[PDB]
Amino acid sequence: SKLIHVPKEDNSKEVTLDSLLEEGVLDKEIHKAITRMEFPGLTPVQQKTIKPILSSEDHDVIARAKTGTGKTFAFLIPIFQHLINTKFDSQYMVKAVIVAPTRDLALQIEAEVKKIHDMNYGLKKYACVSLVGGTDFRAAMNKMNKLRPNIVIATPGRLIDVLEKYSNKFFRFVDYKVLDEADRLLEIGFRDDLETISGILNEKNSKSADNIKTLLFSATLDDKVQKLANNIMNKKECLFLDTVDKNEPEAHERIDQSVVISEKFANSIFAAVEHIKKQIKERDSNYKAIIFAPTVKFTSFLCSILKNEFKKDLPILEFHGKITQNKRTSLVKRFKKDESGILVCTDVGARGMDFPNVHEVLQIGVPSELANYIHRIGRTARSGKEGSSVLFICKDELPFVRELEDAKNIVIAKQEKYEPSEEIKSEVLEAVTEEPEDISDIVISLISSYRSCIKEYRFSERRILPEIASTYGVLLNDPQLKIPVSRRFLDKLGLSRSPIGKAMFEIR
RNA sequence: UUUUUU
Numbered sequence: 113s114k115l116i117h118v119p120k121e122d123n124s125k126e127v128t129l130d131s132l133l134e135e136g137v138l139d140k141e142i143h144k145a146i147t148r149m150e151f152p153g154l155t156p157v158q159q160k161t162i163k164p165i166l167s168s169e170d171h172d173v174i175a176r177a178k179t180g181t182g183k184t185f186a187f188l189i190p191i192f193q194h195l196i197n198t199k200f201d202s203q204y205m206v207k208a209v210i211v212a213p214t215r216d217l218a219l220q221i222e223a224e225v226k227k228i229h230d231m232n233y234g235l236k237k238y239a240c241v242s243l244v245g246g247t248d249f250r251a252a253m254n255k256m257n258k259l260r261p262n263i264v265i266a267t268p269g270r271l272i273d274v275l276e277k278y279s280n281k282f283f284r285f286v287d288y289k290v291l292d293e294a295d296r297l298l299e300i301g302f303r304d305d306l307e308t309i310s311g312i313l314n315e316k317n318s319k320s321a322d323n324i325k326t327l328l329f330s331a332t333l334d335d336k337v338q339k340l341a342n343n344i345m346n347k348k349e350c351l352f353l354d355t356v357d358k359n360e361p362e363a364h365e366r367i368d369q370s371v372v373i374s375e376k377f378a379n380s381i382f383a384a385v386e387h388i389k390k391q392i393k394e395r396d397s398n399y400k401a402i403i404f405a406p407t408v409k410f411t412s413f414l415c416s417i418l419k420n421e422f423k424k425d426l427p428i429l430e431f432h433g434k435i436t437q438n439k440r441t442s443l444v445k446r447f448k449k450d451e452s453g454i455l456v457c458t459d460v461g462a463r464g465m466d467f468p469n470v471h472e473v474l475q476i477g478v479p480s481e482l483a484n485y486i487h488r489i490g491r492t493a494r495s496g497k498e499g500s501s502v503l504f505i506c507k508d509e510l511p512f513v514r515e516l517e518d519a520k521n522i523v524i525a526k527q528e529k530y531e532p533s534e535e536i537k538s539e540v541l542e543a544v545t546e547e548p549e550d551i552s553d554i555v556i557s558l559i560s561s562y563r564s565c566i567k568e569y570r571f572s573e574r575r576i577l578p579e580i581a582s583t584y585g586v587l588l589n590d591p592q593l594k595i596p597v598s599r600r601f602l603d604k605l606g607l608s609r610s611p612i613g614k615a616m617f618e619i620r
Numbered sequence: 621u622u623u624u625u626u
């Protein structure tokens with residue numbers, strides 16, 4: 113194929129809903145829906161993508177725009193227009209398939225489609241069904257059958273599951289497929305799923321294998337992502353529509369970034385607590401924050417510490433892949449509505465989730481991938497609002513911060529050191545009710561986590577892994593102590609002849 | 621180890 117760049121222009125003539133209506137691009141019914149939301153105007157990415165997506169040209173579209181700047185409606189608006197344009201054809205059939213990397217993000221995109229319905233009841237005829245894991249499969253299919261949706265929103269696993277059994281019934285007339293958070297959906301462990309999805313939709317399509325037009329959206333995207341998307345893009349040319357300069361960092365400039373550097377990984381726990389205590393005092397409990405952690409087990413632990421310190425001041429919500437899907441959904445609903453509170457999560461909540469008026473994003477440790485730094489802090493400072501972020505790390509994670517500068521051109525101006533008082537250590541540790549076995553599970557999860565990103569973030573394995581393991585002794589308040597392990601376990605990790613493993617583990 | 625059908 114061939115890539116057509118369309119970079120960020122200086123004084124490009126503003127595009128509005130009114131202008132698009134008069135031009136023939138938008139029908140009155142979708143113009144009225146969006147107009148009724150009382151937005152000041154269309155965001156830059158919306159201004160840039162709406163007509164090119166709807167255009168009669170035979171192209172795929174790639175779009176980059178910063179966090180919180182309205183990518184969702186950037187694709188929903190033209191999708192609706194396409195359904196109106198073709199209202200008399202295959203009306204009981206799926207014409208647009210939107211795919212997301214998490215269930216909660218798919219369900220949020222569905223809720224945004226519902227907001228379009230709620231603003232113009234005349235658009236309800238273009239029905240929508242979400243197909244995501246952790247929901248009753250049969251009930252969703254009853255919904256497919258009852259509503260005969262034109263729009264499907266899905267996570268990959270559940271979509272493949274459905275496609276293998278019912279692609280002929282609902283999916284032989286798909287015109288558009290959208291990968292939101294496209295870069296994530298083309299990493300290893302999603303790429304093969306997307307290629308299966310793409311191959312099934314293409315083989316089943318009633319006009320041809322190259323009918324489907326593909327749209328990719330992310331805050332983090334380059335030309336290299338078009339290469340990764342090669343087996344799933346049908347068209348002869350690809351528009352790259354960019355609202356961010358070539359060199360400009362992908363992080364949203366309105367975010368006030370800082371990093372707090374400790375000598376030990378565990379000390380980031382105490383720094384975080386002192387930070388939150390201070391923000392609750394200074395803001396008189398009017399504090400809405402999200403705090404990210406590396407693993408499910410440490411997220412749970414972190415939540416217990418924060419409930420013991422702060423449950424009296426603020427609700428504390430625990431959000432990760434092992435929370436049941438019903439509770440994930442209810443807590444997302446609550447946290448979107450609430451004025452204050454602390455959401456404690458893994459990267460399940462790093463991308464896409466739109467929680468209005470979060471004041472701060474806090475990170476304890478590193479994200480699951482470089483890019484997810486940009487997405488994490490992007491949970492704040494959304495839709496014109498302000499926001500700040502704090503990264504709590506230890507000295508041995510500093511090469512992560514240098515990689516942000518080298519790879520993504522992100523330079524964090526505010527940087528300071530931290531050392532915990534014995535008073536804060538005692539306060540936090542004495543209310544830890546986890547058993548030694550539990551602390552071991554927790555720290556072990558962090559070792560596996562850090563080990564998997566050593567190369568990506570240029571860590572010194574010899575320094576970072578022993579530091580992470582020594583968390584165990586910090587938390588049991590004896591820092592001579594090593595994690596008690598068996599020989600057959602240490603052989604499984606491949607460290608039985610390593611000095612690095614000798615410094616982390618005791619063979620009890 | 622983060623997500624992602626069952």
Ligand SMILES: Nc1ncnc2c1ncn2[C@@H]1O[C@H](COP(=O)(O)OP(=O)(O)NP(=O)(O)O)[C@@H](O)[C@H]1O
Nearest residue numbers: 151153154155179180181182183184331464466495
């Ligand atoms: N034209 C607009 N004017 C003002 N607000 C808008 C507009 N379009 C969308 N929004 C709001 O902006 C918020 C963020 O939109 P969203 O589509 O989630 O951003 P995004 O670019 O997908 N962010 P991310 O997924 O984190 O990269 C939502 O609460 C929308 O209601």
Ligand SMILES: [Mg+2]
Nearest residue numbers: 183184292464
């Ligand atoms: Mg988004």
